[PDB]
C-alpha cells in the first residue's frame, strides 16, 4: 500500500493480542511504545528527542504484527505520548520513503 | 528517489544558497531546523516531542529544496540535534510511504 503524509501515518499494530495505534516514524531509529508490561529482562536506556531524554525499558527480541504483517525487533517502553515503529521495525515491513 | 531505512534517511537541503543536511521525519508534523539565521520577522511557536515541549521561531514562507525539489514553506528554527523535515514539506515534495 502506499501512505501519504497529508495526516499522520497511523497504522493498527498488535502488541501481544491488543490492536493499538501507532505511528510509522521514519525520523525514530527505535521503536517506543506506551508504559506497559513485557515480558522480559529490560535494560534502562535514556533516549532524547525533542523535548530531551526520557527514561525507558530496553525489551531484546519482541514481536510486533505492523499492519498485517510479523515483524521482530528491539522495543523501548516509556513514558511516550504515542506509539513510535521506528527504523528497526519499518525495515523488516520493507517500507520505502518514495518521492 | 526511493529511499530505504535501513540507515538514517539523510538528504541535503539547499537553504539560503547553502548546503545542509536533513533528517526526513514522517513522525514530525513540522519542519524544524537547528538554530541559524534566516531573513524575515517570526512568531513563537511552541512544538513537543518526546521528552516535553521546546520554544522555537517559525517564520514563514522560506524557499527550500529538499533533494532537488524546490519547496516553500513554513520553517521553525529551534534548538535541534538534527535538521528535521516535517510533514508540512514532505508533502509539497510529493513523499510517501510504500510497502
Ligand atoms: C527514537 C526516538 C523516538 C527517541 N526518536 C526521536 O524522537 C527523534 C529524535 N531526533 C532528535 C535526536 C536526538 C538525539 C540524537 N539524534 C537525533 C529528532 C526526531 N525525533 C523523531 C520524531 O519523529 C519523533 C516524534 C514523536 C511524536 C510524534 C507526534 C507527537 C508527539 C511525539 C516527534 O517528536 N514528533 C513531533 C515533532 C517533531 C518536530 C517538529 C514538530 C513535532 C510535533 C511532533 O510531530
Redesign the interface.
Known sequence: ??????Q??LVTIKIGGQLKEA???????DT?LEEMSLPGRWKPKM????????KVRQYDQILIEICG?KAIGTVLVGP?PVN?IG?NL??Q???????
Not at 515491513?93 to 518521492?99: A, D, H, S
Open positions: 500500500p502506499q501512505i501519504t503524509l497529508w499522520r501515518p505511528l510509522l516514524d521514519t525520523g525514530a531509529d517506543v533516549i532524547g528527542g525533542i523535548g530531551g531524554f526520557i504483517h511516550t513510535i527504523r519499518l525495515t515491513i520493507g517500507c520505502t520513503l518514495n518521492f
